[PDB]
Amino acid sequence: SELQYLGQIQHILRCGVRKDDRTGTGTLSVFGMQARYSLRDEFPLLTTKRVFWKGVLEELLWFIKGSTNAKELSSKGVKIWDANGSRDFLDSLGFSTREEGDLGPVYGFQWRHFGAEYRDMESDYSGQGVDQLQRVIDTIKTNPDDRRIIMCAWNPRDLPLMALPPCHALCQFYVVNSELSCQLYQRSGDMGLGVPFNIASYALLTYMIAHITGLKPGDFIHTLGDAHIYLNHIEPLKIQLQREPRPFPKLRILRKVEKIDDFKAEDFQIEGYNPHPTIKMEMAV
Amino acid sequence: SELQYLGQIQHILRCGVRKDDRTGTGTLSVFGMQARYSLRDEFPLLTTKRVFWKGVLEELLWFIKGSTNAKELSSKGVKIWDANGSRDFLDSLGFSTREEGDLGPVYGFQWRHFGAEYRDMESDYSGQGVDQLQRVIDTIKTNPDDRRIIMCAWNPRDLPLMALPPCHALCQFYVVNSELSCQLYQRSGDMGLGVPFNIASYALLTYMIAHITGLKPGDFIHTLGDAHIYLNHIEPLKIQLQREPRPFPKLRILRKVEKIDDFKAEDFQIEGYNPHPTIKMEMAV
Numbered sequence: 001s002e003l004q005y006l007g008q009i010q011h012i013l014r015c016g017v018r019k020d021d022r023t024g025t026g027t028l029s030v031f032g033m034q035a036r037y038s039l040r041d042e043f044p045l046l047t048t049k050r051v052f053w054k055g056v057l058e059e060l061l062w063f064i065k066g067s068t069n070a071k072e073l074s075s076k077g078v079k080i081w082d083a084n085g086s087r088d089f090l091d092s093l094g095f096s097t098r099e100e101g102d103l104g105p106v107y108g109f110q111w112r113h114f115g116a117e118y119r120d121m122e123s124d125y126s127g128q129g130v131d132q133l134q135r136v137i138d139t140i141k142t143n144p145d146d147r148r149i150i151m152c153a154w155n156p157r158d159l160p161l162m163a164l165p166p167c168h169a170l171c172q173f174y175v176v177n178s179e180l181s182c183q184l185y186q187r188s189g190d191m192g193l194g195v196p197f198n199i200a201s202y203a204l205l206t207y208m209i210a211h212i213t214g215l216k217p218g219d220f221i222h223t224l225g226d227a228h229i230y231l232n233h234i235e236p237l238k239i240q241l242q243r244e245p246r247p248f249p250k251l252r253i254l255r256k257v258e259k260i261d262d263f264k265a266e267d268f269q270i271e272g273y274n275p276h277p278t279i280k281m282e283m284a285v
Numbered sequence: 286s287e288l289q290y291l292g293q294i295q296h297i298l299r300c301g302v303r304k305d306d307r308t309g310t311g312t313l314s315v316f317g318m319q320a321r322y323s324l325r326d327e328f329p330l331l332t333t334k335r336v337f338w339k340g341v342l343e344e345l346l347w348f349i350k351g352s353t354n355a356k357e358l359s360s361k362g363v364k365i366w367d368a369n370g371s372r373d374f375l376d377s378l379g380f381s382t383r384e385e386g387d388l389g390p391v392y393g394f395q396w397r398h399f400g401a402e403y404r405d406m407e408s409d410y411s412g413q414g415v416d417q418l419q420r421v422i423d424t425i426k427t428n429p430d431d432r433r434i435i436m437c438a439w440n441p442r443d444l445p446l447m448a449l450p451p452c453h454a455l456c457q458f459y460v461v462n463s464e465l466s467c468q469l470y471q472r473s474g475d476m477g478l479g480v481p482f483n484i485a486s487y488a489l490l491t492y493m494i495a496h497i498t499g500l501k502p503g504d505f506i507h508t509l510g511d512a513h514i515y516l517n518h519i520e521p522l523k524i525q526l527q528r529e530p531r532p533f534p535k536l537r538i539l540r541k542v543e544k545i546d547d548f549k550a551e552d553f554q555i556e557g558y559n560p561h562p563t564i565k566m567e568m569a570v
């Protein structure tokens with residue numbers, strides 16, 4: 001299972017093409033990739049390097065709340081969005097009227113209030129827009145065979161207002177044999193930094209909706225568009241490529257939860273996670 | 286190249302799971318698939334069965350025009366959308382106020398006028414919404430390294446107004462070594478009927494934008510969500526699996542075109558297309 005990610009790293013270091021990007025450092029890029037990660041009695045948290053599990057859990061809770069405020073996530077101890085919500089970074093894109101911390105209409109706003117007119121991060125959008133997340137959960141409950149269970153974060157109208165366009169832009173759910181599966185289309189994948197984070201994120205989301213809809217987790221299909229390795233990540237990934245993968249851990253929910261909003265960080269417990277030491281990989285801004 | 290499609294049919298007949306659907310007849314379904322079709326000096330028009338090439342060309346031109354009128358495509362001789370735009374089918378979905386032929390906000394409306402308020406099929410939306418198709422062509426001209434060249438047809442706001450939700454919902458373009466590539470995320474794939482039609486469709490779209498932006502066609506990556514084989518398609522597909530695949534044909538554009546709207550059906554010529562006889566496969570409504 002984890003051999004698919006490491007096999008994607010091998011294929012990009014060997015067959016990747018040089019390609020400049022938005023940031024400064026170039027990449028080795030490959031277009032069009034797909035890997036399948038089983039969720040049956042295991043959770044896909046990479047073992048060749050310690051993955052920031054506390055950030056995955058808190059960011060998803062921050063996603064489910066519908067918040068677009070990096071400070072509310074930073075208050076929990078997760079600074080991954082502080083960079084993209086700084087006065088320096090915000091002023092660069094022409095959002096000088098915008099208060100610090102407002103990422104604009106991003107994943108949390110599109111998941112719960114798709115189509116509503118975005119005011120600011122402190123507004124109240126309850127009853128406005130399309131609540132895709134709850135609509136997904138309802139369809140799985142009443143019509144699991146439906147082929148239209150999609151949560152889309154790519155809004156061409158709200159694109160000029162986002163600090164960073166959605167990278168995991170579209171996901172689709174699927175039910176058969178009382179197993180819930182999820183396929184994610186990621187338009188842009190930082191194979192060293194974001195991709196392991198995104199894999200655990202949507203795997204955790206599948207466990208949540210499976211717990212709500214009374215199903216067993218099945219497969220997570222990760223579909224990549226531009227899969228790229230930043231130049232300053234080549235050396236750290238070559239080290240991680242030498243480490244022997246260890247068996248995946250397991251995720252256990254500790255209390256029966258009925259609504260998706262009532263999930264708390266204390267409800268989850270990762271058991272048997274024995275990863276290799278963390279490898280530093282700098283973020284390209 | 287064509288062995289990937291036939292291999293997907295082979296995999297679904299062996300490992301597919303029974304699954305009921307919107308229509309009457311069940312399916313054999315598989316969730317999560319990806320195939321890569323090269324566009325270099327060949328066009329992926331299936332040879333184990335004659336593919337409706339005249340419908341592919343006219344429907345795409347009908348898509349580029351932005352039309353949501355099934356009658357306007359039927360006037361050219363393509364009846365594939367007449368079924369979904371009949372008074373019987375339209376009245377069923379609660380669109381009794383809607384005039385016959387109006388498919389609602391569909392691919393043509395989302396490609397050229399994303400986010401505008403949909404009135405009727407005869408309206409004029411010039412200047413309204415986001416012109417995703419032209420923005421895609423402009424970005425490829427000025428910033429080919431951009432990782433956000435996406436044309437999205439899935440609009441959660443306009444979903445309750447569509448006669449049929451988008452099956453090919455999102456596509457992304459990619460440029461390297463002066464080669465243009467396209468990846469399509471198809472949420473639902475009729476492996477017997479629509480999938481061969483969709484493969485040639487977006488392959489033709491890549492040839493068009495490659496001609497406009499002065500690039501060479503690269504790869505078409507077809508990504509499937511629910512890839513399903515209808516029960517009444519099992520026998521025709523088992524016949525097609527017995528035929529030996531023949532080399533792909535070639536597409537030649539006959540005049541230099543500068544705008545995407547100025548493409549005419551007479552500008553294209555398929556050379557060397559020697560397919561096996563057409564196999565009838567009934568559409569599930």
Ligand SMILES: Nc1nc2[nH]cc(Cc3ccc(C(=O)Nc4cc(Cl)ccc4C(=O)O)cc3)c2c(=O)[nH]1
Nearest residue numbers: 051052055079080190193194195197278283284285
């Ligand atoms: N090039 C580029 N830009 C990005 N912007 C936004 C993202 C998304 C993104 C960003 C960070 C992480 C992540 O685990 N971080 C950290 C992990 C540890 Cl263990 C310690 C510190 C950080 C940190 O640095 O806070 C996961 C996803 C992202 C990305 O992945 N690549």
Ligand SMILES: Nc1nc2[nH]cc(Cc3ccc(C(=O)Nc4cc(Cl)ccc4C(=O)O)cc3)c2c(=O)[nH]1
Nearest residue numbers: 336337340364365475478479480482563568569570
């Ligand atoms: N179950 C289901 N419903 C659908 N609605 C919309 C589509 C999409 C769709 C529909 C039709 C075709 C197609 O090549 N047609 C034909 C081919 C020949 Cl050779 C002759 C006649 C027709 C015809 O049909 O006139 C391709 C895609 C579609 C689908 O593929 N499956």
Ligand SMILES: O=c1ccn([C@H]2C[C@H](O)[C@@H](COP(=O)(O)O)O2)c(=O)[nH]1
Nearest residue numbers: 022165167188189190194195198432
């Ligand atoms: O969840 C996320 C968010 C971001 N990124 C990376 C992909 C890109 O390297 C960068 C965003 O750059 P653009 O492709 O939007 O230019 O962030 C991820 O991999 N996963």
Ligand SMILES: O=c1ccn([C@H]2C[C@H](O)[C@@H](COP(=O)(O)O)O2)c(=O)[nH]1
Nearest residue numbers: 147307452453473474475479480483
């Ligand atoms: O371009 C298209 C259009 C339609 N379909 C098929 C997929 C499904 O079998 C059906 C659409 O119905 P739903 O999946 O929304 O139920 O049409 C395709 O394969 N390709």
